[PDB]
Amino acid sequence: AKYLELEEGGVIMQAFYWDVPGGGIWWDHIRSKIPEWYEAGISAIWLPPPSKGMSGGYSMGYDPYDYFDLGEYYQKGTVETRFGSKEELVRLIQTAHAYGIKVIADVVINHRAGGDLEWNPFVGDYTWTDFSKVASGKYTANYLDFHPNELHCCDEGTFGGFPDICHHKEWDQYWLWKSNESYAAYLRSIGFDGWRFDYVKGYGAWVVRDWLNWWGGWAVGEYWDTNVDALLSWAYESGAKVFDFPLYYKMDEAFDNNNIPALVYALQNGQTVVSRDPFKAVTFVANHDTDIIWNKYPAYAFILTYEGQPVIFYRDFEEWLNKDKLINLIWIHDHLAGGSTTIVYYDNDELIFVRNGDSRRPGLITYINLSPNWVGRWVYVPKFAGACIHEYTGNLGGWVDKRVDSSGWVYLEAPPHDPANGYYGYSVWSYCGV
Ligand SMILES: [Ca+2]
Ligand SMILES: [Zn+2]
Ligand SMILES: [Zn+2]
Ligand SMILES: [Zn+2]
Ligand SMILES: [Zn+2]
Ligand SMILES: [Zn+2]
Ligand SMILES: [Zn+2]
To answer: Is Disulfide bond included in the keywords of this UniProt record (predicted)?
Structure first.
């Protein structure tokens, strides 16, 4: 990482989206992007499930068939996965590490797919639970490894009618994380540093907790719910972070409907993970499963200058949004956005807050404007009294410096929110000369 490292709360890039171009070109494509992302300040990349899926060439990895086939055996109609070959993935990992960029594996262990029809004694009918033909010959399995079985019928949850893995069985524990021949062992052996656990509401937190006890590494769980209490409960029990879906929805409530107050209220009344425990919050503006925020500039300006650990969605960075503004925000996040937060001003369409700084980052002032006009405000920010502050985004159309005299008062300006015309709706300030 050029600036902050992953464990230091550096910015993360979700290096994919739903239905990325197939043909096994993804691993090499992302690898060609490491140099640029390195210079941009990306500290880690989150890659899609790497194992051969039931849908083979069309698989996004969430319907894993042969865990130990990272695109190396002809199976399910293809040698490479939709993303590429095992060597291409390994090479991608190595290139990332050459630049100090960490790699996060998307771990899909709630369900499995592509098994052969097999008569099931616990259901009284045929189920696709026969995984004895796995080309890798590793972690084979049958109905006993899925619900229902002689242990219990069900667990926390299921998904898309796919065989639901029973992590309580020793065979399954051994093959997934409890041994040096385990899936976790394999992923690590090729260089994966951290983990992103898929659909964790489908099984117990004890699974992630033990996985982590064995391998460690940065970890986040996809616990999709709006109840902060449930998310933090799982976070603490598993030992991992959680995606801040609560913040996600509140940002949409605010930024997409001129309702900044809804976000302020949420942040103040612990209605988001980040406002409760910032060390457990992995923030985002969009992911491959959901993308409801249309006013993404104020959104990115917020997760990249506010507390928490931000994730940049590939499609926003490499397709839909102005890359330079995001790169600029990444720089601001790693150099200025530190410390506690103080809300300075807010109304229906404006939000101004101060980051008081930490030992590495001086702090800053974020001014988000959702209105269609240029705005200005006299704000009291004693944190910057006696200093020269500079607007770091360039969103004001030019180089703007201002003196915050001893008084602590300063007139701050923000551009209109009209991204369709190049006005992004936000300005970020901090001491001049950083
Ligand atoms: Ca389950
Ligand atoms: Zn290839
Ligand atoms: Zn079970
Ligand atoms: Zn999910
Ligand atoms: Zn929206
Ligand atoms: Zn790029
Ligand atoms: Zn206003």
So the answer is: no
User: Quick one: CA dihedral 77, 81, 83, 85, positive or negative?
Assistant: negative
Residue 422, sorted as left (phi over 0), alpha (psi -120 to 50) or beta, turns out to be left
- Separation between Cα atoms, residue 77 and residue 377, nearest integer Å: 62
Are the beta carbons of 64 and 3 closer than 8 angstroms? no
Give the ligand at the shortest distance from the Cα of 326: 6
CA of residue 144 to ligand 3 center, whole Å: 9
Q: In angstroms, rounded to a whole number, what is the distance separating the alpha carbons of residues 108 and 14?
A: 16
Ligand 2 centroid, distance to 46 Cα (angstroms): 20
Ligand nearest the Cα of residue 197 is 4
Give the ligand whose atoms come closest to the C-alpha of residue 255: 5
Fold for 338-434, please state it.
Immunoglobulin-like (2.60.40)
Give the Cα separation of 276 and 49 in Å (integer): 30
Following DSSP, what letter does each residue of 16-78 receive, concatenated?
A: --TT---SS-HHHHHHHHHHHHHHHT--EEEE---SEETTGGG--SSSEEETT-SS-S-BTTB
Domain ranges of the chain: 1-337, 338-434
Distance in Å, CA 347 to ligand 4 centroid: 34
**338-434 matches 1-337 in CATH topology:** no
107 and 82 Cβ atoms separated by less than 8 Å: no
Cα of 24 vs centre of ligand 7, distance in Å, is: 49
Q: Which CATH architecture has domain 1-337?
A: Alpha-Beta Barrel (3.20)
Name the resolution in angstroms: 2.2
